[PDB]
Amino acid sequence: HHHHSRQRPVALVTGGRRGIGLGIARALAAKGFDLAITDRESDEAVIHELRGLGGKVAFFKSDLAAVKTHEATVFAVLDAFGGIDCLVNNAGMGAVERGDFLALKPENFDTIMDVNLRGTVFFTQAVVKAMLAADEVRFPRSIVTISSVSSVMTSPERLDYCISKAGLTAFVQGLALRLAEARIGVFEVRPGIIRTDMTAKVAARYDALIEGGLVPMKRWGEASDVGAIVAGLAGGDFIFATGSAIHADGGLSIAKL
Amino acid sequence: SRQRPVALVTGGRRGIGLGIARALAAKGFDLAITDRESDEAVIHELRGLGGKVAFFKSDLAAVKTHEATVFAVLDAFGGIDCLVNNAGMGAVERGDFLALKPENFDTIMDVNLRGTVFFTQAVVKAMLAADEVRFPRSIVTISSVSSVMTSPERLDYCISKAGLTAFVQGLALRLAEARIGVFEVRPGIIRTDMTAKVAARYDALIEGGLVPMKRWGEASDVGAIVAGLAGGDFIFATGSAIHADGGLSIAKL
Amino acid sequence: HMSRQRPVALVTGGRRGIGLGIARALAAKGFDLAITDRESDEAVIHELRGLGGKVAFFKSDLAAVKTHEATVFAVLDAFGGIDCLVNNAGMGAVERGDFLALKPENFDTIMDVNLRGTVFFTQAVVKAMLAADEVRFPRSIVTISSVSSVMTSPERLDYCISKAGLTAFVQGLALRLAEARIGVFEVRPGIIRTDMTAKVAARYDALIEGGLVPMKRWGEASDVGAIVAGLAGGDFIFATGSAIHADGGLSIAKL
Amino acid sequence: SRQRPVALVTGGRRGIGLGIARALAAKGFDLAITDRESDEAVIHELRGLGGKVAFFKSDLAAVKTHEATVFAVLDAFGGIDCLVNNAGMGAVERGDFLALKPENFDTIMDVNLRGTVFFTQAVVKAMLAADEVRFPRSIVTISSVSSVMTSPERLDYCISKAGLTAFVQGLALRLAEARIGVFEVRPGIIRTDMTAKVAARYDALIEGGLVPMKRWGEASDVGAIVAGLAGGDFIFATGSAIHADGGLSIAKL
Numbered sequence A: 001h002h003h004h005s006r007q008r009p010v011a012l013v014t015g016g017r018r019g020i021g022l023g024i025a026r027a028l029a030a031k032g033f034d035l036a037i038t039d040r041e042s043d044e045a046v047i048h049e050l051r052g053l054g055g056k057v058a059f060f061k062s063d064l065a066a067v068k069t070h071e072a073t074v075f076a077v078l079d080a081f082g083g084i085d086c087l088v089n090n091a092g093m094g095a096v097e098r099g100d101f102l103a104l105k106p107e108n109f110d111t112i113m114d115v116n117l118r119g120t121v122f123f124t125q126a127v128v129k130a131m132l133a134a135d136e137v138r139f140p141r142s143i144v145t146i147s148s149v150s151s152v153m154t155s156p157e158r159l160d161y162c163i164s165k166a167g168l169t170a171f172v173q174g175l176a177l178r179l180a181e182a183r184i185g186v187f188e189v190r191p192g193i194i195r196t197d198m199t200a201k202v203a204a205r206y207d208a209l210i211e212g213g214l215v216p217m218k219r220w221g222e223a224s225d226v227g228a229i230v231a232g233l234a235g236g237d238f239i240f241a242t243g244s245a246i247h248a249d250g251g252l253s254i255a256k257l
Numbered sequence B, D: 001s002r003q004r005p006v007a008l009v010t011g012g013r014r015g016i017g018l019g020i021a022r023a024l025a026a027k028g029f030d031l032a033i034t035d036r037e038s039d040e041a042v043i044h045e046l047r048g049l050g051g052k053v054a055f056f057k058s059d060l061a062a063v064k065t066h067e068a069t070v071f072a073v074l075d076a077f078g079g080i081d082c083l084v085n086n087a088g089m090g091a092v093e094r095g096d097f098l099a100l101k102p103e104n105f106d107t108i109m110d111v112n113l114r115g116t117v118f119f120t121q122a123v124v125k126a127m128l129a130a131d132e133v134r135f136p137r138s139i140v141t142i143s144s145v146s147s148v149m150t151s152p153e154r155l156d157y158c159i160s161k162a163g164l165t166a167f168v169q170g171l172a173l174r175l176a177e178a179r180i181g182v183f184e185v186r187p188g189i190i191r192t193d194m195t196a197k198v199a200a201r202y203d204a205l206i207e208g209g210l211v212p213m214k215r216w217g218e219a220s221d222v223g224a225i226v227a228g229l230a231g232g233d234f235i236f237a238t239g240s241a242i243h244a245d246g247g248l249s250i251a252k253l
Numbered sequence C: 001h002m003s004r005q006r007p008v009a010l011v012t013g014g015r016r017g018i019g020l021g022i023a024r025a026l027a028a029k030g031f032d033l034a035i036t037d038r039e040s041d042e043a044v045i046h047e048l049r050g051l052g053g054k055v056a057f058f059k060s061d062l063a064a065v066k067t068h069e070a071t072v073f074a075v076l077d078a079f080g081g082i083d084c085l086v087n088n089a090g091m092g093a094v095e096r097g098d099f100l101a102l103k104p105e106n107f108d109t110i111m112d113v114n115l116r117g118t119v120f121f122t123q124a125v126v127k128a129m130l131a132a133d134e135v136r137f138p139r140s141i142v143t144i145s146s147v148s149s150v151m152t153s154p155e156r157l158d159y160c161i162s163k164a165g166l167t168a169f170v171q172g173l174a175l176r177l178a179e180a181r182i183g184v185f186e187v188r189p190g191i192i193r194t195d196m197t198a199k200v201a202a203r204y205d206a207l208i209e210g211g212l213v214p215m216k217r218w219g220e221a222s223d224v225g226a227i228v229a230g231l232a233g234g235d236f237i238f239a240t241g242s243a244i245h246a247d248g249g250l251s252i253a254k255l
């Protein structure tokens, strides 16, 4: 129960209490991963549900923006599981206030950059330190970062959100190179329009946009769509595809005229 | 009717296409192998992987023959669930663009781009008319990192593969409502007969760090990726491009 | 012996549309002009001569690659050298419709002109440029592709493919010509008011008015000409390999 | 009503920003120059070109000072026609990503990305409040090929520049109806203070052909490009990115 040769691979999913992160966690548990979930607060019903899929599941309280606590969080994961095979950088937030770029406030820019970009980058640094020190490597290893189609499609009413995600796109490319000899597959997943709490406030507009054809596959994405994709990348069949970006968007980001 | 999904793999007799065929067989697909060259010994070996396999002789460039080939695949299997556009050829000559000959440009374009486009058309006609759709469906097109990394000594090849990149995007839109996942796979430096003549120069480059993973790609690397996409988990990712290159195409300074 | 005193631009498909807007802009900047096209418009040539330089017409089918060497030699005989090549000649898809109905012969027609023809015409011109004994002016090759290189239209994939092939060609051409200090650029027009767009004016009208084009207007041939003339003047030599979108923002990916 | 257009060039006391300022002055612009520390001499160098030149002390990272800086510019010149976002800094330390310090990440992000974004915000407010628009208007942002080419030993620098790429795209949409051309310029390897400590590595790479044009870039190369875009001929190309790199960022195999 301390220092836990492991029989199952270990995925660390940030922001895994709900939404896309929970869909990812369910998919990884179904493919046979033990789960270390982080989030700002716990949901005991969630942990129970995930435990009903047959694997080991533990929750770790963490503010992704609090970079000074990341090393301790990674220590807690290692003490509970012995190693980390898959990191899913999922936790993130939308813009504090959508509106004219001329009204964008620096405090709001800072909040979202601190979480989505700065927090993700140094949480990844803390985990990679542990992965590179792993004495044994018996499972495929991956780092999957949930960015957004907003990395490559701009929304002028929330340029702080777009900038933070585009920064992740750049970070993934460099991280892939840094981890290539360690045989850690490094991938970017760009969700489009997914049914979660982050899109609930804009749900009516996105409804009509989806009926109008904005999304070529003409439906909302589900957290289980992103989860199936992430679990596919974490299984090891895509190791030689390190550096690839996957668009989990039903074709939304296909440029068309 | 059919109880196992059917993959049609062009150029599936050897190299990357054979790696893809093996990986799809392990994933539970029956196999329609097409190629302009026959090798029944390879077909026999594929049958050892547990599924049904049939071979169809086809020249990818001979677009007037594609309809009959697709009809023959339908006759044998009743339907097509996955198309892998793998058949292709390298440049006839490598050398100064100033010496590029239009006949050699034509040979490569007729196979890699024109042939792939209209062979895909013939298969899509069949897929859109499927009575039953019981398995995930996909069209996976093997282009190359040469779609996005230029080689001035073989611009005809690079152009043919860049054309495939554009075709894939439009095809994904056309087939989105039919729920056929449409993907591009860009192999980097893979150990096949296509790289055989330059195998010593690439051996040197791979060691020197040109490929961040510092190894040859294998047909089985591309096969595992293609089989991952064909299983259905990536349907909502239609239009995606996957680099099967150990990091080769990551732009770095 | 005394080399030419004005730079020479060869503009393919320069009889009308974007090619003519490019020709007018280059003539105003002091370029002599070698215009190629399938048919001549003598009134156009006279109009271009009104700007004060030498203008000469050369009948050429861009798809007829066996004739390109003779065309280039005829330009050299008349002008002594080529400083700027504008690859502008091109055609729209023969028929817009479902990809399932696309015909190989129509695919070939578009590919033979837009892609194959452009590539080997460029090859013929580059042979001449690399043999030039004197280089007194900035040199460039500017290729008019399209936003369709990077924005797909499933009802005319042959056209998109032909232009996406040009994008790849321009990147390798820029590498081949970097030591010769020939600036190689791609220009991607968006929706421009020419005979190529006249049949779909109604649909583009509404897209434009609705802000699909962020600048909310049709492009004109003079918009592309101003951009091309800017590139041909030499200030962009160190930007070789760059692509310019002449589209009022159309191709900015937005959500 | 002012009779010459006014360009505001950040970080314009040396290097690329000074080359841009020189190029704009030669094209008939008056110049408002900023930099962190005072400079009495750059005015006299630029004044030889015949226009009006003024220097303004401004820390680009100090967003609360930006409003006063812009007002000081308006007081001296009446309006701003062209903004060149040139000020920036390289990574505080190069080294393994594993050792990247958050404080150094913050310093570079505060200047290159956050500072640029909110200084543009302040300047744009002035431009949209203009009574008179007699000259072509533009905003040219100097990012880097590091926006699109990764350097794992300085990922903070790359991320800050990639953020600018996204910013410029959204800014171009925001200003499209105001007829303000919005452009990104990506320098490659330019001979300035910023490359001085790695000039030996870059000499070997440049001579080896990493840069296809096989020479160092100079401040006047970027300046000629930026002045080209500021002249109005590229207004219908708003949103375009120009690579000022001698072909460095052309992806090649």
Ligand SMILES: NC(=O)c1ccc[n+]([C@@H]2O[C@H](COP(=O)([O-])OP(=O)(O)OC[C@H]3O[C@@H](n4cnc5c(N)ncnc54)[C@H](O)[C@@H]3O)[C@@H](O)[C@H]2O)c1
Residues within 6 Å of the ligand: A014, A015, A016, A017, A018, A019, A020, A021, A038, A039, A040, A041, A062, A063, A064, A065, A090, A091, A092, A093, A094, A115, A146, A147, A148, A149, A190, A191, A192, A193, A194, A195, A196, A197, A198, A199
């Ligand atoms: N939902 C979409 O349509 C969509 C589209 C593109 C990208 N994304 C990205 O997907 C990811 C998941 O978002 P979602 O849609 O599931 O939203 P969500 O709000 O439903 O779930 C996000 C989870 O992350 C947690 N989280 C947020 N900030 C955190 C912090 N500072 N520390 C720790 N945990 C934190 C939240 O508490 C929550 O449990 C985000 O990165 C988001 O930007 C979502």
Ligand SMILES: NC(=O)c1ccc[n+]([C@@H]2O[C@H](COP(=O)([O-])OP(=O)(O)OC[C@H]3O[C@@H](n4cnc5c(N)ncnc54)[C@H](O)[C@@H]3O)[C@@H](O)[C@H]2O)c1
Residues within 6 Å of the ligand: B010, B011, B012, B013, B014, B015, B016, B017, B034, B035, B036, B037, B058, B059, B060, B061, B086, B087, B088, B089, B090, B111, B142, B143, B144, B145, B186, B187, B188, B189, B190, B191, B192, B193, B194, B195
């Ligand atoms: N090997 C690499 O490093 C590499 C890299 C990037 C892309 N690719 C692409 O991968 C694909 C497979 O190539 P490979 O490396 O396995 O080479 P390969 O030559 O070993 O195999 C190609 C197969 O396709 C068949 N084929 C060729 N021309 C054909 C035609 N006209 N009609 C029908 N079948 C035809 C051949 O008979 C052979 O069985 C090609 O599209 C190639 O361009 C290869």
Ligand SMILES: NC(=O)c1ccc[n+]([C@@H]2O[C@H](COP(=O)([O-])OP(=O)(O)OC[C@H]3O[C@@H](n4cnc5c(N)ncnc54)[C@H](O)[C@@H]3O)[C@@H](O)[C@H]2O)c1
Residues within 6 Å of the ligand: C012, C013, C014, C015, C016, C017, C018, C019, C036, C037, C038, C039, C060, C061, C062, C063, C088, C089, C090, C091, C092, C113, C144, C145, C146, C147, C188, C189, C190, C191, C192, C193, C194, C195, C196, C197
């Ligand atoms: N109009 C637009 O909105 C738009 C957008 C993007 C790209 N383009 C491209 O701009 C270029 C110019 O087109 P345009 O809009 O001016 O159309 P256009 O039809 O008005 O003019 C094209 C000119 O090229 C000539 N030409 C065509 N095929 C030729 C051939 N085989 N050989 C020689 N000359 C030939 C024609 O005779 C004509 O004079 C083309 O490459 C086109 O694809 C146009």
Ligand SMILES: NC(=O)c1ccc[n+]([C@@H]2O[C@H](COP(=O)([O-])OP(=O)(O)OC[C@H]3O[C@@H](n4cnc5c(N)ncnc54)[C@H](O)[C@@H]3O)[C@@H](O)[C@H]2O)c1
Residues within 6 Å of the ligand: D010, D011, D012, D013, D014, D015, D016, D017, D034, D035, D036, D058, D059, D060, D061, D086, D087, D088, D089, D090, D111, D142, D143, D144, D145, D186, D187, D188, D189, D190, D191, D192, D193, D194, D195
């Ligand atoms: N030199 C290259 O090879 C290269 C390549 C790509 C991009 N760039 C970019 O070009 C721009 C100019 O850099 P350079 O090469 O001329 O280097 P430089 O150091 O010589 O010039 C940058 C100037 O900006 C000033 N500056 C820095 N931080 C500032 C701040 N907070 N507020 C105000 N002024 C500030 C510096 O004092 C200096 O005068 C930078 O954005 C740099 O990132 C340079």
